[PDB]
Each structure stands twice: as structure tokens, then as C-alpha cells.
Amino acid sequence: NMLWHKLPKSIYFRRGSLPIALDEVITDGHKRALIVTDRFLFNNGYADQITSVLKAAGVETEVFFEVEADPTLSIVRKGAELANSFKPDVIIALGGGSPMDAAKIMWVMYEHPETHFEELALRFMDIRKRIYKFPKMGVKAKMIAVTTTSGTGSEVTPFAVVTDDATGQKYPLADYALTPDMAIVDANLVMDMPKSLCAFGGLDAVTHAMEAYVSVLASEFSDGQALQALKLLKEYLPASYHEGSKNPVARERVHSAATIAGIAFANAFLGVCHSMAHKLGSQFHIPHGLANALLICNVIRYNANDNPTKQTAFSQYDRPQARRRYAEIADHLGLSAPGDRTAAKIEKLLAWLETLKAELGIPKSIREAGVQEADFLANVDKLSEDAFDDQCTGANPRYPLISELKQILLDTYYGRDYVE
Amino acid sequence: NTPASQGGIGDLYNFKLAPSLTLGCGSWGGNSISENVGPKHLINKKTVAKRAENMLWHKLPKSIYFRRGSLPIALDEVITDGHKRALIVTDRFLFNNGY
Amino acid sequence: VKAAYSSGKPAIGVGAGNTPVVIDETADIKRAVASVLMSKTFDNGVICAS
Amino acid sequence: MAVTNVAELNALVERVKKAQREYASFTQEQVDKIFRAAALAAADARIPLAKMAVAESGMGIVEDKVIKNHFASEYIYNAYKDEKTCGVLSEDDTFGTITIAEPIGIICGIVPTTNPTSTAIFKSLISLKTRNAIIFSPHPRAKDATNKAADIVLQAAIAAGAPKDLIGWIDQPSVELSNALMHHPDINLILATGGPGMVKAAYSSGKPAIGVGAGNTPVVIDETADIKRAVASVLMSKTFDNGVICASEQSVVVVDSVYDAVRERFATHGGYLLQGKELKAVQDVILKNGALNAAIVGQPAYKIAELAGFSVPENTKILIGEVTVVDESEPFAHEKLSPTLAMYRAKDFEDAVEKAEKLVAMGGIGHTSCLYTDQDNQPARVSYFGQKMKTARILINTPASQGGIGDLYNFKLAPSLTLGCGSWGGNSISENVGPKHLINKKTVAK
Amino acid sequence: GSPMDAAKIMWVMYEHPETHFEELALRFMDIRKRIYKFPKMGVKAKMIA
Amino acid sequence: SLCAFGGLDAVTHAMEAYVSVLASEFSDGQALQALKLLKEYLPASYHEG
Amino acid sequence: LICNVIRYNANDNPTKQTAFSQYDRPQARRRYAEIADHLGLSAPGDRTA
Amino acid sequence: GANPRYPLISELKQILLDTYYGRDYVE
Ligand SMILES: [Fe+3]
């Protein structure tokens, strides 16, 4: 076997960086441009910042603003039609989270129109095999990406999700050729968003990183950059919520710290916590980020035990264990005395996770979020049978069985604490 | 094959030639050529310059494979894709032995 | 113009220098004698660079 | 051979004239081959060539004349590489016209004792790209360095397709010899530099001329600005080669609201003020016979204090004074070429600017001017400074000359030298020389 | 070390023969400037190591 | 006699990228992962082989 | 050399380029201490030097 | 480019002349 470590070609980043890099895609050979944008980011003056700079040197451009909170396999098909009506050469994404995914699927059906969608949903479905091969991309196009919020590293990772209009099914893609050829990470575009979106995303990164250290695909390449995220998110995050734009230094480092952790979960797959929050955030209409925020404190007591159900030759001997690895966070981060044991280091981590959710102002249990006691015992069964097959359990050393994954969904509704 | 100054009117001589005047110099010494005045000699121009913030980077190759027993497997990926001819470079001690 | 250049100030000058005409053997004669004769009786020969 | 007296100067000027007429028929393809193997051999000899100008002259540090000889020998081979100045330039064929070019002649030259080597690499890589020649005339105190560097460029040009005696240089000069290399009939340019000693006599000789001068450029500090930063940049760009770089800082105008915090800050890091009896002792050393002295030019900080009589610690960098009168009489507004300075007092912003126009026109020429302030909360004050000063550069939150290495300052700014004028009178701006002033162009018409 | 430094020169004068080696020693000598660009590489090769 | 002359280069290739004047928050976490590995296994890969 | 040059990067150093490595980049000495902790060669109570 | 203190030549032959005999540089 053989691990890997893949990334893009280039990551520019500092304050005041978008007009300079964009001067690099006109001195070379580029003439025609296409843009993708969310609805809210066109009625205000954000998407005009990159349209005027391109226009003075002279390149034609056309906007495309209909992508909602999720793609539906019908709007994206409108882009392939608009694509081959103007013959673009560069695809400039923009936004955070959702709008980038839809701008990734319209690009693969622009280089290959004849490819029907039944071939790209069964040959590439999980990034651990390598038997097949994906066609060569980048003949008459190359992609760009930009980020607007802090908490979702979807610009340097090969993950893309779409759902069907007819049945209500999910189809994920994953293979290491959809990654763009130039990322950009600016902080001048995030100084104005309110103080309710900078504590979900800024709490999303903490969960996006604290599973890449415990999985069974982390090598000595990815273990490092993840421990640089957890450190930069205990000195500055509390000071980016009480002050906002008054302290423009601290706002920058949080934003240059999620996309760090993005590098970690693109070379080592994620745990279980980033599965149960998909369905719990696209069937009750919760935004992603609060869901894994309400479950991260409950899984840590679930991966640390004897675990009678655990596959052998991996996660038992080839990989050391899932327990002692949680300790090494409790001493590099500085939440332990010099003389301690294994167990007491766990608890002093877990308290640090509760005192952060307090001052940031999020609820405790699902009940305070706006879910009635009407649609939670009649839908727990069609919901807990989905977390077993939605791209997880490759990680999360404890091999889960379905009759115990519903205890966590049923003790995080009344406020109780899971325990054996 | 053309007169010096210009003609009158009643003819089709070349039209976009500047007049005889509006053509001066900058000296008297010797072997000095003339050039045409206009609104670029009466205009001195300046420059201003602010302080822009620099930008950093983080650049790498596309791919780094690694683990015990990974030289043959990866090197099969180069021949399935279209590649026919291959040059090699090497030191000396790495050729008189079996590396 | 000769006193202007020497005054302790910048200057430019619109001068005039005697410009020649050259006729070789291969040329036409019936035409290049009646053009020189036109551009000299134009305002009695005071145009600069005649 | 050596050129001592006038009886053979009329023999050197005749040999080059026999060669220039052999140079002015080459084509564009084998002149861009000399220009390559003449720049490299000046950059690849940057450190036998600075160490030989410090032992004779007596000033300057060896560590700063190495990152200045490399900046004036590759900026001049990054912009004038592809600019056609030979044969044919352009061709429009609606009726038939072309724009051939030709050179001038023979370019004299003058060189000072301050930068004896940098401003000779620069005059021999454009006078060798536009099909002409040069003749030097150096200063006595540095006659060994300048003649050296104009020999490395030559003997590397000969062995790529060049003729023999295209460049020459006097040895063992004086004043009486130089006046014959400006009235001789067969030279028609002069590129003079230095202080206002020789540039003033060059403009008045019955020949065209340009001059690379220097005028005392001010610094302005208002109240809104940062103080912890714009005192430690001025303090860097003045101890760079002991303050002989052309267009350095010479005066620091400051408003009153923060005058009592931009005084002691100087005293802590590297400064040493003076306000008493010592002020008249330093005031009688830099002005001897109505002109500048040659006894301190380039020397370090504490030694001039030894000329007057008092003593100073060893690790000092600059000597600050303070006065309030601004004309001829008080000697701190004349350029000095030394690690010294002068600070003034002013009431408010709008009067400080009024106290800088009067300094610029004293020196005769405008070169630079710099202002420290905030640039995101006063868009109306940084633009009011662009319609009242008269120079060619206006810097905002940035030192004057340049930094060393160990930093990321702005890179595509031209050097301080290679920036001259055409007069001396008043309200005259400068502009950058290059291969468009040494090229007169023609037109033909069928 | 020693051979790999020579296999990055053997590639660039194979894709661009008319360019000498005296031009690529005065533009590019320190990685902080970003003004002058390099001729594009990767047309008729790609380098393993 | 060639697992020490080489190995001590890595330590020195890393203990200058954590002090220089161009370091970001990217290139520090990796240059710290080198020193921790090289103290717990280098004295073993020379005495034994 | 790496056991001698270290003592010549932690001093007062009279000549130092300015506007970088004085106020934009923090310092050199204090960063040589963080390695002493992450690497496990420090008691819980000590000074910088 | 790195090495924060701007060096100077007179203090860069003292390092090469004290790590040869075996001494330790010190100011
Ligand atoms: Fe090394």
C-alpha cells in the first residue's frame, strides 16, 4: 500500500491580495471568462470587485446567479448549456460551501458532453481504491477558487455533492482531479459579516481537524498541519466575536487557519461526526456547522473504550489506538498539569470544549434550536440507517453498529450525557 | 521626387506632411538634427507611490507518493497514460551496481 | 536665435538652413525643372525651408 | 599609454574618431551581442572593485558598495534589452515612409569622488548600445578606480566583435586640462554629476548638456501618523554608506502636537541632540569659503565631532540639530553629504508644506519628497500634497533611497541616480535618461 | 544532490535551445522578485524525480 | 558513515526555517514535525542499522 | 557551525535592517525557546535565557 | 535574505577563526 499527499499548485494569501493574483491570469493567455456566484453576493457590491479589474484590460465576462443553498441536478445542467454557448476558458468560482460544489460539476460536463451521469456515480465513490482512471481534465479550461467565509475548506479538497430532483437521493463524487489549479485566501472580503456566522464556521474548523488526527489514514505529513489549527483557535477566536471589525489582526488568522485544516482532511478522510450532521442539517433545515457543534462533545466518550466491535489488523495493531492520541492534544495545547494520567487528560480537554460553546452563545441540545417533539421519533429510523453508508466508517476506529448509533441521536435531545 | 515646401491648391500632393515651420532644435553647434514641437515639451510629469502590502505563497509539486514498497507501483502509472520514450540521468556509482 | 541660446535659460529655436537640390543623369528633366520653379515663386521665396 | 598634458590630448580624441566611424555601420544583430558580455563582466567583478575604492578615497563602508554595484548593472540589462535603435524602427505603407536612426558623436563625461565606480558602469552600457563612444575625466582622489572599471568593460567587448580603441581615459588630471575637453570642436555632449560646483559651469559652455544633480529633500510628519515606525526608517536610510547616496534625507519638518515625543525617541535608539554651545562649533566646520568642505564628506558620525573639540559615544549614528531660520545664511539647508540633519518646528499641517517649497527651490532642482501619514483615513490630504510640490517623485510612507537586503521593499523603482535635468533656473523638473536622448531620428518620403 | 541539480538545467535548454545561459543568470537569481516571468515549461516533457 | 553527514543536514535545514523573516503560519507546523521525529529514532539508526 | 552561530543570533546586534525584523516580524531569540518546550527539554519553571 | 541581523564582514571571520581552534564565540 502507499499513502499520498496531493494539493494544488498555488495558494496566495495575505491582506490585500486579490487584485495582484488576478493580474496573473491576464498576462498569460486568457481572453474569455465565466463566473459563478451565489444570489446574495450579486445584489451587493462583492462580485463587482473582480469584474471591473478584468474589464479594463479587456476580457468578456458573463454572470450566472441562480445557485441556491443546495444543487438539485437540474440547475447545474443549465450551466453546461450556457458553457458551450460562449466557449469559456476560465471558471472563476466564488462563495463559501455550497456554490463551489455546483461550479465543480458543470466543469466536468463541459469537457465531456457525451458522458452520461450513470458512469460518474458508480466508478468513483470512495477515495481509497485506485483501479480505475478518470479522464484528463484541463484541455480547454482551468479552474480558480475564492473563499468568502471562515470555516469550510472546500477550495483545496476533492469533495463534491449533489442531490436528485426526482427521488430525493444523494450522489457523491470523489477523485483527485477536480481540485482547482489556483486558490486564493483573502481576508479583506470578511470584515462585515455578522456575529452569528463567525461562530458556526469558526467552530466547524475545530471539528474538521480533530478527526484527521485520530483516523486510520493520517501519516507523518498531515499530523503536523492539524496541530497548527487547534493552537490558532484558542488565542484569537474569543477575540473575534466580542470585537468584530475593531481588531482586524485576529480576524485574519482564523481565516488563514480553516483552509490550513482543509489540507488535513483532503489527505486523510473524516470521522463519523461529519456524517450524522449532513442528514440532520438537510432534512430539518438546520445550517451546517451547528450540527457537528452539538455532537463533538458526545462522540469523544464513544471512541474511548474497549469497543468489542473493532476490525482486526487495522486500528488495533497497524495503528496504535484512538485513546492515547487524544492525550497528545491535551499537552501540546496546554491544558494539563505536569503530573497526570491518561484519563484525567481527557476530562480537561472536554471541559475546554464546553466553556467555548458558552461565551460564543449557542444552545445546548437540539430542542432549543427549533425542532418539535413531533417529527423526531417517527423519523429516527429512516435517519439512523443513513449514517451507516454516507461515506464514513473508513475512519472512526470503532466499527459502529446501527443499534447504538441511535443512542447518540436520542441523548442529544434531552440533554443527557452518553455513558456505558 | 517632390518639392520642398508644398504646393498651392489645384493638385493632389501628399497631404499629411507637417508644415515647414513648427520644426526647431536645441543647439547651434554642429551635426544637430531637428524635431517637431507640440504639447509634450511644455509638460513636466511626476510620479507618486504608496506602500502596498506584500503577498506570500506556499507552492509544491502535484503529488508525493511514499511508503516502503512504492517505486514499482507508482512507476506503472506513467506507462498506462501516454508515454513512449524515457531518458534517465544517474551518477557513476549508481550504475556499476544494481540500483 | 544665436543670442537666445546664450542667456542662462532654456530655449528652442525655429531656424532655417540652406537646403540643396541634386539632379543626376537617370532622372526626368521635363518635370524636375518645373517643380523647383514653382516652390520658389511662392510668396516670393520667404517660406522657411525653401 | 599615459595622457599627461595637452600636447597629446589632441591625439587621443583623434583615434576614437577613427573607430566610431567604423562602429556606425554594424547591424542590430551583432550589437546586442556586445551588450551581453559587457554587463556580465561588470557584475561578476563586484568584489575586487569596491574594496579598491575604499583604501584610496578614505570614506565609505565595504558592505554597502557591493549591493549598489549590482543594482546599477542588471536594471540596465532588464529594460533596454529589446528596444530597436539601429537601422530601421517602423514602417507605415499607406504612401511610403520610414524612420531610420543615427547616433550623435562622441560623449564627454565627468565623474565625482563620491560614487567613483557606479556612475561609470552606467555610462558605458548605453554609450555602447547606441553606437557611440565616451571619454572620461575623473577626480584626483580616485583616479585608480574609475580608470580600472572602464577597462574591464573594454577588454571584454573587444573579444566579441568590437573594434580596438573605443573608450579612453585621462590619467593624472587637473583643472587646466579639463577645460580643453569641453571646447574642443568634435565632442557635442557632456554628462556631468557632482554637487553644484561643476554642473553650473557645464550648462554655460556653448554646447548642450544634461546634469545629474541633488537637492535637499525634506521630510514631513503630521499628527495622525505612526511614530514608532517613521523614526526608524529615516534613521536607516541615512547611515547607508554614511549618507553620500544622491537624494537622501536632509531635513525633518514636524508639527507641534507631537514635537515633544519625536525628540527623545531619537535620543534613545541612535541619536544625540545638541542645543547649546556645541551648535556653533559644528556650524563652523561644514562651511569654510562659501562652499562645502572636503574634510568630512563620507566620514562616520563621531569623527566630525572630534574636529570641533567635544566627544561622543562610539555607537552613535547621526547628529541632530535644531534651528528655525531658513535661507542661505544658516548652514543646515545646503546639502552636506554627511550623517547630519536638521529639524524644524511648525504650527499646523498647512504651514509645514509652505516650509518645504522654500527649501526645494534653494537647491535648484527637485528630485524627491516624502510624507509620513495615514493613507486610509485621509484621502484628501495625500492628494493636496500632489498639487503644491515640484519634483518628479512623491513618496508616501516609504524611505527615500532604498533599503539593503533582508526585506521586501518595492522593487521596480529606478535608482536614485540616472535622473537629471536640462537647466538650473527655477521650477525645473527632472526626468530619466536612457537610450532615447542619444538618438536623433529622420524621415524619408517617396 | 549533485545529479539532480544538473537534470533541471538539461531540461530547460532542451525545450528552448535558442536561449543562451548568459540571460538566465541576470534576471532570475533570488526568489523574492515577481516582476520578470519565466518561459512556460511543460510542453513536451514532464519530470519525475 | 553516510547516515550522519546526511541526517545532520536535515536538522539544520529545519532549524532555520522557524526563525527566518519569511515564515508564515503554513511553513512552521511541518518544520517542527522534523525535530520531534529525529530525536527518537536517529540514535537507533546508527548503532544498529 | 550550528553550535556556534546560534549564540550569534541572540544578542543586541547594533546593526539591524529596519521596518522588517524589528516591528513586522517579532524577534529571533524568543522563537529559539519554543523549540525547547515542544521538544521536551525544559522544566516547568525557568527563564528565557 | 533571512538571518535577521544584517551581518558585517569583520564579524564573519571571527566565526571561522574560533571554530577551528575549538573556542566558542562570545561578545
Ligand atoms: Fe544541506
Side-chain angles (χ1 to χ4, degrees):
Chain A
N1 44 176
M2 45 176 280
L3 281 299
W4 46 96
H5 182 112
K6 283 182 161 84
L7 281 185
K9 187 70 168 173
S10 307
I11 298 170
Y12 301 100
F13 61 101
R14 282 296 79 178
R15 304 188 66 210
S17 196
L18 181 44
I20 314 193
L22 188 66
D23 190 84
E24 194 270 333
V25 301
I26 70 187
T27 191
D28 306 0
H30 286 346
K31 309 290 278 166
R32 310 190 91 85
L34 193 147
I35 295 165
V36 169
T37 314
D38 197 352
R39 198 183 277 287
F40 185 87
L41 281 75
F42 182 63
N43 275 336
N44 290 310
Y46 282 4
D48 200 359
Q49 198 161 0
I50 63 174
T51 310
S52 158
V53 179
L54 274 159
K55 201 176 280 183
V59 289
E60 301 93 305
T61 184
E62 57 281 350
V63 185
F64 179 99
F65 56 108
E66 56 273 65
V67 175
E68 296 177 353
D70 301 75
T72 80
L73 202 62
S74 201
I75 295 92
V76 304
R77 218 180 270 280
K78 200 193 296 190
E81 190 73 330
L82 186 61
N84 52 19
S85 68
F86 199 65
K87 319 310 183 195
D89 219 320
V90 302
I91 302 182
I92 304 183
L94 194 148
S98 55
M100 193 175 284
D101 286 338
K104 213 172 276 163
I105 296 288
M106 60 177 77
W107 177 40
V108 80
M109 66 175 61
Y110 172 58
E111 282 285 27
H112 289 123
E114 58 169 308
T115 301
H116 191 65
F117 207 77
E118 73 178 275
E119 198 201 316
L120 314 187
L122 291 170
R123 286 179 77 124
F124 318 106
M125 215 192 279
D126 53 353
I127 50 157
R128 293 177 291 177
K129 299 166 127 192
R130 203 173 156 192
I131 188 162
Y132 315 103
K133 188 152 279 288
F134 196 94
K136 301 173 290 208
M137 293 195 73
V139 175
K140 64 196 186 202
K142 84 195 191 99
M143 194 166 161
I144 309 284
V146 180
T147 311
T148 47
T149 189
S150 66
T152 68
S154 294
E155 53 271 52
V156 297
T157 175
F159 279 58
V161 70
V162 304
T163 194
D164 184 57
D165 195 306
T167 307
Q169 219 69 35
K170 303 295 193 189
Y171 295 152
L173 267 77
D175 212 318
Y176 284 113
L178 319 189
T179 57
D181 297 0
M182 174 143 58
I184 292 168
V185 169
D186 200 314
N188 198 4
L189 310 190
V190 57
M191 288 290 204
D192 312 324
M193 59 177 205
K195 58 170 172 177
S196 81
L197 188 56
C198 203
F200 298 136
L203 203 70
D204 199 19
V206 164
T207 295
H208 272 269
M210 208 157 81
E211 290 291 331
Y213 182 86
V214 73
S215 160
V216 290
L217 290 176
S219 50
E220 58 261 20
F221 280 74
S222 176
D223 188 289
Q225 271 162 18
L227 279 174
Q228 197 70 0
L230 280 174
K231 185 67 164 291
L232 299 184
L233 303 186
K234 77 183 280 293
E235 275 73 352
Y236 291 91
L237 200 77
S240 163
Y241 188 56
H242 290 307
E243 315 307 302
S245 173
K246 202 190 301 312
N247 191 357
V249 192
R251 270 277 199 182
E252 193 274 350
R253 279 179 206 289
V254 163
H255 176 56
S256 163
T259 194
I260 288 294
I263 293 175
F265 74 78
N267 299 347
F269 201 78
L270 287 149
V272 74
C273 167
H274 205 256
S275 166
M276 293 138 89
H278 278 302
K279 310 292 134 164
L280 190 61
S282 187
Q283 195 254 315
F284 293 9
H285 283 76
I286 282 167
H288 171 34
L290 167 60
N292 48 16
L294 289 152
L295 304 170
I296 203 75
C297 179
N298 204 348
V299 181
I300 275 160
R301 298 181 217 70
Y302 173 53
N303 287 352
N305 257 329
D306 289 1
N307 294 352
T309 42
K310 185 168 276 175
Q311 44 72 209
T312 300
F314 267 85
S315 66
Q316 193 164 3
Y317 305 100
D318 193 27
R319 198 63 50 191
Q321 195 60 262
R323 187 180 196 195
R324 272 190 282 114
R325 285 202 94 100
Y326 276 101
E328 290 173 19
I329 316 190
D331 69 334
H332 162 233
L333 209 63
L335 291 181
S336 163
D340 289 305
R341 294 215 309 167
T342 292
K345 279 177 174 190
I346 291 281
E347 205 268 309
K348 276 174 183 176
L349 170 66
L350 206 48
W352 179 82
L353 265 173
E354 294 277 30
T355 65
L356 196 80
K357 296 187 280 170
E359 65 183 346
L360 293 170
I362 49 173
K364 172 50 185 156
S365 305
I366 287 278
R367 206 150 56 166
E368 287 78 341
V371 191
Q372 301 267 355
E373 184 58 22
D375 300 356
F376 207 68
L377 278 78
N379 268 12
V380 71
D381 297 333
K382 190 61 65 172
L383 185 135
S384 177
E385 195 259 334
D386 194 272
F388 201 89
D389 75 319
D390 198 312
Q391 298 307 141
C392 78
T393 69
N396 213 49
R398 188 178 192 288
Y399 194 59
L401 70 171
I402 317 189
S403 306
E404 289 290 330
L405 195 61
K406 70 188 278 169
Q407 208 84 10
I408 305 303
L409 284 164
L410 210 63
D411 286 351
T412 316
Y413 198 91
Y414 308 145
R416 265 181 291 102
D417 294 331
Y418 181 81
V419 54
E420 272 73 348
Chain B
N1 281 331
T2 288
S5 71
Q6 45 183 339
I9 51 178
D11 37 54
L12 280 72
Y13 63 94
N14 47 14
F15 287 85
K16 55 188 292 189
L17 261 183
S20 311
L21 76 163
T22 78
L23 194 59
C25 74
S27 77
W28 189 258
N31 311 70
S32 70
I33 314 305
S34 162
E35 60 187 357
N36 53 356
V37 309
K40 60 176 193 168
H41 286 43
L42 299 174
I43 293 295
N44 292 327
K45 45 176 78 176
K46 302 199 282 280
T47 57
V48 311
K50 291 196 278 280
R51 187 215 199 170
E53 192 68 86
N54 53 0
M55 59 192 298
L56 275 290
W57 51 77
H58 180 105
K59 285 181 169 117
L60 293 180
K62 188 75 169 185
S63 313
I64 308 193
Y65 308 120
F66 78 111
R67 183 71 90 173
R68 188 192 279 265
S70 181
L71 175 49
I73 296 165
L75 199 51
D76 277 283
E77 193 267 328
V78 76
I79 51 170
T80 65
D81 207 344
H83 282 342
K84 267 276 277 181
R85 307 169 78 88
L87 194 146
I88 289 167
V89 177
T90 309
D91 211 334
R92 190 159 270 165
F93 194 87
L94 285 162
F95 184 51
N96 286 336
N97 288 0
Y99 284 124
Chain C
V1 72
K2 188 146 54 44
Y5 298 142
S6 300
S7 316
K9 284 185 182 295
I12 60 175
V14 180
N18 60 332
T19 67
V21 180
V22 165
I23 304 167
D24 72 77
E25 54 264 30
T26 314
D28 203 321
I29 304 302
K30 202 168 74 204
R31 194 179 274 91
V33 70
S35 282
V36 163
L37 195 63
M38 178 258 281
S39 174
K40 194 67 172 67
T41 193
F42 186 92
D43 194 12
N44 290 26
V46 307
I47 302 300
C48 285
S50 69
Chain D
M1 59 301 292
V3 187
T4 2
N5 50 336
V6 68
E8 51 271 52
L9 186 65
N10 281 311
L12 188 73
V13 73
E14 193 275 331
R15 288 211 303 281
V16 309
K17 184 173 150 188
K18 196 183 161 291
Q20 183 268 351
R21 205 139 51 70
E22 202 178 328
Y23 205 107
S25 175
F26 273 109
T27 176
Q28 173 54 23
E29 180 53 32
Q30 72 180 319
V31 72
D32 193 75
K33 191 169 161 286
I34 300 165
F35 192 29
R36 195 168 65 230
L40 198 147
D44 205 348
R46 57 176 170 282
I47 196 157
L49 176 57
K51 195 150 68 72
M52 205 158 63
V54 75
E56 316 205 347
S57 194
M59 72 288 283
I61 315 174
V62 187
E63 306 144 35
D64 295 332
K65 286 199 206 302
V66 176
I67 52 173
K68 177 157 73 97
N69 218 131
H70 193 41
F71 197 66
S73 161
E74 73 94 4
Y75 167 77
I76 204 79
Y77 179 36
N78 278 333
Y80 307 150
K81 170 154 68 71
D82 46 36
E83 183 161 334
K84 290 197 79 170
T85 67
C86 290
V88 170
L89 274 80
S90 44
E91 176 157 27
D92 204 69
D93 202 335
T94 190
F95 286 119
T97 50
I98 50 177
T99 48
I100 66 191
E102 72 181 359
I104 290 164
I106 295 161
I107 282 163
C108 170
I110 296 179
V111 174
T113 178
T114 298
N115 319 282
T117 195
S118 169
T119 176
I121 306 285
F122 169 72
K123 279 156 187 157
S124 298
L125 297 193
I126 49 166
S127 62
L128 196 61
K129 167 65 168 169
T130 57
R131 315 199 294 197
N132 48 0
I134 52 161
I135 296 169
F136 286 123
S137 171
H139 209 254
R141 266 167 92 196
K143 64 177 181 280
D144 272 63
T146 306
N147 304 352
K148 186 79 161 52
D151 188 280
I152 292 168
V153 182
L154 167 52
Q155 300 292 354
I158 283 163
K164 180 63 125 180
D165 209 333
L166 181 56
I167 291 168
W169 57 97
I170 293 156
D171 204 272
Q172 204 169 36
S174 184
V175 169
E176 176 236 340
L177 193 142
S178 167
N179 279 323
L181 193 63
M182 296 167 83
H183 303 166
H184 207 267
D186 217 329
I187 58 178
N188 44 21
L189 272 295
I190 47 175
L191 308 198
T193 80
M198 59 297 279
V199 72
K200 188 146 54 44
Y203 298 142
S204 300
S205 316
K207 284 185 182 294
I210 60 175
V212 180
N216 60 332
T217 68
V219 180
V220 165
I221 304 167
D222 72 77
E223 54 264 30
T224 314
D226 203 321
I227 304 302
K228 203 168 74 203
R229 194 179 274 91
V231 70
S233 282
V234 163
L235 195 63
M236 178 258 282
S237 174
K238 194 67 172 68
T239 193
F240 186 92
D241 195 12
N242 290 26
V244 307
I245 302 300
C246 285
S248 69
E249 315 288 3
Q250 302 292 316
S251 300
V252 180
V253 157
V254 61
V255 310
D256 187 73
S257 169
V258 298
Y259 180 40
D260 210 342
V262 181
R263 189 189 180 201
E264 65 94 19
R265 189 82 195 225
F266 279 99
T268 301
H269 281 214
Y272 170 73
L273 287 79
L274 62 92
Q275 56 87 33
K277 174 56 183 171
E278 284 82 345
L279 175 55
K280 301 292 179 193
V282 186
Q283 265 191 43
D284 266 6
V285 172
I286 65 174
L287 197 74
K288 202 170 65 166
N289 293 345
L292 189 65
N293 195 340
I296 58 160
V297 61
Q299 292 276 34
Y302 78 105
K303 192 151 277 180
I304 66 183
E306 206 279 319
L307 272 291
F310 63 90
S311 179
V312 188
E314 194 27 6
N315 68 340
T316 48
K317 298 195 180 180
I318 48 167
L319 272 70
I320 287 167
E322 47 180 2
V323 309
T324 182
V325 67
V326 58
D327 316 279
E328 213 323 317
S329 23
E330 190 69 16
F332 290 94
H334 290 329
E335 81 305 345
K336 294 161 298 323
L337 318 184
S338 173
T340 62
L341 217 56
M343 77 202 310
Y344 290 123
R345 188 191 267 257
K347 302 182 280 179
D348 297 326
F349 182 74
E350 185 55 49
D351 197 286
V353 168
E354 221 188 13
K355 222 171 287 205
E357 271 184 351
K358 222 185 282 167
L359 280 172
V360 167
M362 188 192 287
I365 300 162
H367 206 273
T368 60
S369 295
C370 46
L371 192 140
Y372 287 111
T373 199
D374 184 78
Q375 58 181 350
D376 284 343
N377 298 345
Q378 273 86 3
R381 201 173 276 171
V382 77
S383 176
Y384 179 84
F385 204 63
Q387 300 291 110
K388 192 71 71 58
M389 308 298 274
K390 266 158 280 198
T391 57
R393 289 179 175 173
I394 293 164
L395 295 167
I396 297 296
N397 281 331
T398 288
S401 71
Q402 45 183 339
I405 51 178
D407 36 54
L408 280 72
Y409 63 94
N410 47 14
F411 287 85
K412 55 188 292 189
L413 261 183
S416 311
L417 76 163
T418 78
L419 194 59
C421 74
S423 76
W424 188 258
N427 311 70
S428 70
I429 314 306
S430 163
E431 60 187 357
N432 52 356
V433 309
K436 60 176 193 168
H437 286 43
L438 299 174
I439 293 295
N440 292 326
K441 45 176 78 176
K442 302 199 282 280
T443 57
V444 311
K446 291 196 279 280
Chain E
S2 57
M4 216 185 300
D5 285 81
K8 294 166 195 161
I9 306 305
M10 212 182 78
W11 175 22
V12 77
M13 63 167 59
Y14 158 79
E15 195 166 322
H16 285 126
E18 64 189 354
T19 287
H20 299 246
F21 197 73
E22 282 158 14
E23 207 198 65
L24 316 192
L26 293 166
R27 296 187 97 150
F28 303 96
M29 60 190 158
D30 47 359
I31 53 165
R32 296 170 287 166
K33 297 167 166 191
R34 197 175 165 282
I35 315 162
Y36 317 109
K37 65 184 292 197
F38 206 97
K40 56 167 148 182
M41 285 186 69
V43 165
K44 62 187 204 170
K46 86 193 189 88
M47 179 155 168
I48 313 286
Chain F
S1 197
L2 210 70
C3 204
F5 301 160
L8 276 163
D9 209 5
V11 163
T12 300
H13 272 281
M15 216 169 72
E16 281 284 341
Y18 196 37
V19 71
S20 162
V21 78
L22 286 179
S24 316
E25 55 262 24
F26 282 67
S27 76
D28 289 14
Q30 268 162 352
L32 272 177
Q33 197 66 8
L35 307 178
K36 179 60 170 291
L37 296 179
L38 286 178
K39 92 187 274 284
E40 285 168 87
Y41 300 118
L42 207 73
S45 180
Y46 177 72
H47 281 301
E48 311 304 294
Chain G
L1 270 58
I2 211 78
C3 82
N4 211 336
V5 74
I6 298 294
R7 302 201 197 72
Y8 191 11
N9 273 347
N11 279 121
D12 239 341
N13 281 305
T15 320
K16 171 137 62 180
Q17 53 94 219
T18 294
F20 278 94
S21 72
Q22 263 202 351
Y23 310 99
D24 303 11
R25 208 61 50 188
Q27 193 54 265
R29 188 184 192 185
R30 203 159 54 74
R31 282 179 90 88
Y32 276 112
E34 277 180 25
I35 304 186
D37 290 329
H38 178 220
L39 196 63
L41 291 174
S42 172
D46 261 79
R47 300 185 62 70
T48 295
Chain H
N3 193 231
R5 63 176 174 76
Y6 186 59
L8 71 166
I9 287 163
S10 164
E11 295 184 351
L12 210 62
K13 62 175 272 183
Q14 195 70 19
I15 305 308
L16 283 165
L17 189 62
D18 281 349
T19 198
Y20 175 82
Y21 303 159
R23 284 189 268 113
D24 45 354
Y25 178 82
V26 72
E27 307 193 345

